[PDB]
Amino acid sequence: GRKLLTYQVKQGDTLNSIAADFRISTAALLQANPSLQAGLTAGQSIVIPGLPDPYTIPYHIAVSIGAKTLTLSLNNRVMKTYPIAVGKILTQTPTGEFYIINRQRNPGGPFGAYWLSLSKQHYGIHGTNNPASIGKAVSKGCIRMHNKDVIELASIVPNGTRVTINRGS
Numbered sequence: 001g002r003k004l005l006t007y008q009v010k011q012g013d014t015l016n017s018i019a020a021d022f023r024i025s026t027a028a029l030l031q032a033n034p035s036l037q038a039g040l041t042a043g044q045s046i047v048i049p050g051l052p053d054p055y056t057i058p059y060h061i062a063v064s065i066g067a068k069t070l071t072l073s074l075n076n077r078v079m080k081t082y083p084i085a086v087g088k089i090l091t092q093t094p095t096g097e098f099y100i101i102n103r104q105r106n107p108g109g110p111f112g113a114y115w116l117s118l119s120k121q122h123y124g125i126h127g128t129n130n131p132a133s134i135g136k137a138v139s140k141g142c143i144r145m146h147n148k149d150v151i152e153l154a155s156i157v158p159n160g161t162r163v164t165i166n167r168g169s
């Protein structure tokens with residue numbers, strides 16, 4: 001069958017934060033990972049029960065802050081590239097990986113057609129009513145694009161898509 005997801009926590013992470021960071025209960029992430037009853041540890045690896053494994057999944061989101069574009073990739077080759085908010089002077093390479101964990105039903109409002117979640121706190125892939133700041137403005141690091149674009153990606157990238165955000169060089 002298809003495997004459940006793995007996560008590797010970064011220095012400073014905490015149980016509750018990570019659980020509902022994964023849109024789940026700490027107890028469920030505990031059930032699968034009794035190491036975490038007590039807590040989480042930098043570089044430690046944890047399973048996300050009820051969520052499939054990103055290695056069964058072939059999808060690879062390469063959004064380099066340096067590249068200022070988020071590249072979709074299947075089977076070692078890109079699917080398509082979407083523009084995102086990087087900034088005009090924002091350094092510090094976040095050496096970590098996130099996963100496309102969720103997609104939300106048509107909200108009905110300016111939430112941007114779809115709400116897709118990343119795996120670390122204040123990061124998400126979503127939509128907009130204003131795409132003109134996308135890739136061309138300092139929108140405080142918002143990973144949003146056109147409605148249909150974020151639904152394209154949405155339906156292709158599954159509940160465990162690998163996504164990295166790095167300034168590169």
Ligand SMILES: *C(=O)[C@@H]([C@@H]1CC(SCCNC=N)=C(C(=O)O)N1)[C@@H](C)O
Nearest residue numbers: 085124128133139140141142143144
């Ligand atoms: C980016 O497009 C916005 C930015 C988004 C957010 S956080 C929104 C909710 N995310 C999910 N919990 C902003 C914020 O300050 O909270 N603003 C930018 C253009 O203002």
